[PDB]
Design a protein around this ligand. Structure first.
Ligand SMILES: Cc1c(Nc2ncc3cccc(C4CC4)c3n2)cnn1C1CCOCC1
Length: 262
């Protein structure tokens, strides 16, 4: 069919130091996708991880064209935008909606950890929503391999977003990849349930993190979170990453399994 190769760029979806993301619409079919446009070794690594992804809760990669030294990355479009924009400041969202998002988050993180990929920047800006509000883990530009040939490799690179980062990345030289992504999913949950972030970073100098370590859940944001999800957060936001709840045990948590949503 002539012209099915052609896509019109119709809306800006995001701009950063990386380049931009454009909503693209096929000239013939009207299929809508997201095109990440960049102006070397890093994009090479990113494309390689992007090709490994095939799950309903992770953004799908359709392939890439280079024109000149400009790379175009075609991927699944999520027409409902980011989870960030469903969170009402100081309120959060309804507990059933939050639980449903957290289920989908866990499904995508399980998936990634299964294929030996860590995301390293899980936050509501990187969690996108399709036309039916299904959650898609986006942005693989910090993702890396933590398991290959069934052997684990420890991480040392400091990266992510401070209010989301686990405390071991601030205190230890090396750390396991999986407890880091689990912690950031906890902060996601807190945000959905409270419409606020609990601390600037999880350090001994941050009074809001000390308050948590001392159990002062009569303070915000914790006082806004019902006892059942707050139990779960007590098991996720544990400072020692070796004692921190794993995903298989999150799937056994009372709140996680509570029926809430129609
Ligand atoms: C359709 C839509 C999306 N999708 C959307 N879909 C897929 C994406 C894949 C990679 C990167 C991004 C963007 C950086 C976030 C993506 N983004 C994002 N934002 N949006 C609207 C923009 C205007 O405001 C309403 C929401």
């Amino acid at each position: 069919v002539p012209f099915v190769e052609d896509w019109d760029l119709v809306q800006t979806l995001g701009e950063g130091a990386y380049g931009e993301v454009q909503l693209a619409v096929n000239r013939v079919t009207e299929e809508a996708v997201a095109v990440k446009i960049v102006d070397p070794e890093n994009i090479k690594k990113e494309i390689c991880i992007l090709k490994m992804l095939n799950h309903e809760n992770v953004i799908k990669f359709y392939g890439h064209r280079r024109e000149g030294n400009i790379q175009y990355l075609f991927m699944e479009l999520a027409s409902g935008g980011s989870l960030f924009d469903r969170i009402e400041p100081d309120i959060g969202m309804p507990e059933p909606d939050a639980q449903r998002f957290f289920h989908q988050l866990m499904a995508g993180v399980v998936y990634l950890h299964g294929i030996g990929i860590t995301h390293r920047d899980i936050k509501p800006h990187n969690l996108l929503l399709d036309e039916r509000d299904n959650l898609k883990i986006a942005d693989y530009s910090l993702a890396t391999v933590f398991r290959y040939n069934n052997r684990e490799r420890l991480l040392n690179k400091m990266c992510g977003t401070l209010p989301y980062v686990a405390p071991e990345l601030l205190k230890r030289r090396e750390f396991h990849a999986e407890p880091v992504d689990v912690w950031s999913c906890g902060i996601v949950l807190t945000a959905m349930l409270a419409g606020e972030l609990p601390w600037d970073q999880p350090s001994d100098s941050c009074q809001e993190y000390s308050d948590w370590k001392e159990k002062k859940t009569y303070l915000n944001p914790w006082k806004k979170i019902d006892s059942a999800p707050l139990a779960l957060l007590h098991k996720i936001l544990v400072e020692n990453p070796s004692a921190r709840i794993t995903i298989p045990d999150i799937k056994k948590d009372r709140w996680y399994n509570k029926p809430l949503k129609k």
